Structure 1
Amino acid sequence: GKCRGLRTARKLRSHRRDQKWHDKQYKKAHLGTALKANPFGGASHAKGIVLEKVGVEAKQPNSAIRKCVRVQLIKNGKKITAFVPNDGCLNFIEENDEVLVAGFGRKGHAVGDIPGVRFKVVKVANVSLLALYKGKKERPR
């Protein structure tokens, strides 16, 4: 049982911080290795250069080829696979162009069918995928 005395504030705060280190979110936030392993470097978005297009197979009960691209981030050079969302949207991307990439949703976790993909593309050649898909703007090269 818990110590409950009047002069036990040191034991209580010491025990709380040691046992705080056993939480998954607390350790991911405060130990410093998750921020050094994060490709985005703790940023909401990052810009990169497309290296390859790649077709990634959906996890077992779904059967599809999810269209992704392999990008290399500008600021650190780390390599990323990023999903291109809507249908036909892969045809807007060519090789070696700037791509703005955001998170997919689950803060570093794979989302849905796509295995190992944490990222989705947001912009190509500084026009959004949404305006390109709905035909609101055109991309230069």
Structure 2
Amino acid sequence: GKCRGLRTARKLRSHRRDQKWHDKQYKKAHLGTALKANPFGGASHAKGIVLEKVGVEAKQPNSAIRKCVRVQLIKNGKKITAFVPNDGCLNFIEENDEVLVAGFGRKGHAVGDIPGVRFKVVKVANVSLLALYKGKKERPR
């Protein structure tokens, strides 16, 4: 504290108000631009339809082909890319199918060596990928 007086409270309150506004994490949650630019719209999960199965590549140190999918949303129609999580689950996803899309867990940031992804696939055709991986549910037709 700099202004240390007995009847100095509105100066301290206003100064801390502007210095609280002059931040990054608090300013991200108190402006509508970050929420409107977010394709989820402040939601935890989201639905969408598969357009095509793409393959993106890793970064400089490690070399692999991380296989993803291009999904366009239900609620607004934004076009995102989502990473199919586990091994060999790209057979379970076909084109023009409903998927449930969630984040990675770094609050809208790229995770690991995959560039540009912020989303991952939890369910396809209203059945979970874990049951399909473990041979517990079958894809209806």
**TM over 0.5, shorter chain:** yes
- Deviating 4+ runs (over 4 angstroms): none
Residue of structure 2 equivalent to 1:68: 68
Q: Give 1:115 shift.
A: 0.5
Q: Give 1:87 shift.
A: 0.9
Please give the per-residue CA displacement for 1:21-55, whole angstroms capped at 9, x wherever unaligned.
12111010001111000000000000000111110
Gaps of 5+ in 1: none
Distance 1:19 1:83 in 2: 39
The number of residues matched between the two structures is 141
Please give the per-residue CA displacement for 1:87-132, whole angstroms capped at 9, x wherever unaligned.
1011100000000000101000000011010100000000001111
Question: Residue 81 of structure 1: SS of its match in structure 2?
Answer: strand
Distance 2:22 2:132 in 1: 46
Residue of structure 1 equivalent to 2:33: 33
Residue of structure 2 equivalent to 1:17: 17
Which structure's residues are more often helix, by fraction?
1
RMSD: 0.9
Percent identity between matched residues is 100
Q: Give 1:60 shift.
A: 1.0
Gaps of 5+ in 2: none
Q: Give 1:6 shift.
A: 1.3
Residue of structure 2 equivalent to 1:138: 138
Distance 1:52 1:2 in 2: 59
Q: Give 1:3 shift.
A: 0.3
After TM superposition, the score normalised by the length of structure 1 is: 0.97
Distance 2:91 2:75 in 1: 26
